[PDB]
Amino acid sequence: HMPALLKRLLFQVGPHPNERTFTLSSVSTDGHYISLRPFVKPSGDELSFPFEWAFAGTNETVKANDQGNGVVTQDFNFWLDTNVYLNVPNTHRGEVNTTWKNWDSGCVEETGAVYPFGADKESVSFREMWQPVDPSREDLVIVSPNNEKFSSNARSIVLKVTDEAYDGLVIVIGRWIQGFLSQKNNNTIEGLNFIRLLEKDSGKSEFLLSYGKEVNKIPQSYENLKKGSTVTSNGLNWEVIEYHA
């Protein structure tokens, strides 16, 4: 069946929601996921790393479970977590337990608790509102505002880095590509790379976002590949671990 592309509408940890990012979460049909959270208006302090956060994992790193009524649980043990990568203090560590509830509006409420100060301290509950969007469009179009059936012929393609010195995942859903590339032995911002790529109706692709100096080692074209293909971009090998045309 179907991959998912969700646009975050709000983040809330206090009495006060807000949305400082242009966050998109990509979930492939096979279940691989990435979430890039670039700030829209980053301050001078945050220009060096213009992201509120970023994470990714192959399907086995999250346990999804449906209870049927629009309630599903997702238990995350992130593969990529820029917090742990960058050693960001006062920041959750370990599994994260989340609950997802579909609303009649076709948006999805994500809720959960987190332990910024340690597993044996107080928990901070959070909420995030998500808008499913149609990945086969070059614009951000809302899906099912009013109980409509939605089907997408949207391709679902995932490449994974096959190098010992690197971690990397690129997830292609319809026209929207999100990816990361990180240096295994590194805890600095210098070790991170991200891309958000959009294939326009023109057929050309365009970089909505591009962070890091090794971005040219991330494959940017997914034509004429197959599952199991090896793709080499500037000496870096990736394996196509998912290919639903």
Next chain:
Amino acid sequence: HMPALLKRLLFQVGPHPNERTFTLSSVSTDGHYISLRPFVKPSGDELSFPFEWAFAGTNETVKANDQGNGVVTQDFNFWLDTNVYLNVPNTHRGEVNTTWKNWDSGCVEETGAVYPFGADKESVSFREMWQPVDPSREDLVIVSPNNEKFSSNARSIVLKVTDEAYDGLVIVIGRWIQGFLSQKNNNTIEGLNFIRLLEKDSGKSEFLLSYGKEVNKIPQSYENLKKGSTVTSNGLNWEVIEYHA
């Protein structure tokens, strides 16, 4: 100054946000407004009148004040308010005071408080989240998720009934049409008519909602019009009070 079309994302009273509506609010260039809020999945009880609420007014019925920093106040004295047309119990009466704050993500946060059990009772505080969409598109297309300038070439047309038999307002913004028609000297749901009309790329118009027995008295064309002229539909005349092609 630019017409605006907003899609409601959430509606919160209490610790418990949710969204049971496909709510669109239309604000014409001149500042006339209508907000229709049909339920997506009405219960048996709400089958007869499948709308959370519905209101409308000309520009004079709202006071709009910038305080400059993406923050504006809007004080409403509703012309159409189904709560008062129907004398629904436990429901606010009189002016409503609201604050509208833009977020970096390009969504807008609506806050305020209301007095459902009378001005001399406990005030309930609400929040509503709004997504501006591109009225020139037949799909719900998100505008400015990431700080891009948005210029709207969408037409802005509003009609208002002239038969002393009813009250009526149609607001046409680009492809999206919302309208209400109300019987004077009635106080029941039989006095109420609403339409939501969408002109497709084909140039054909689709009903997204049609409610009431006199729906056909609301014009559905808008083609050869002049401000000040009158437009008629099945024996009912309307004035073109706004025309910006």
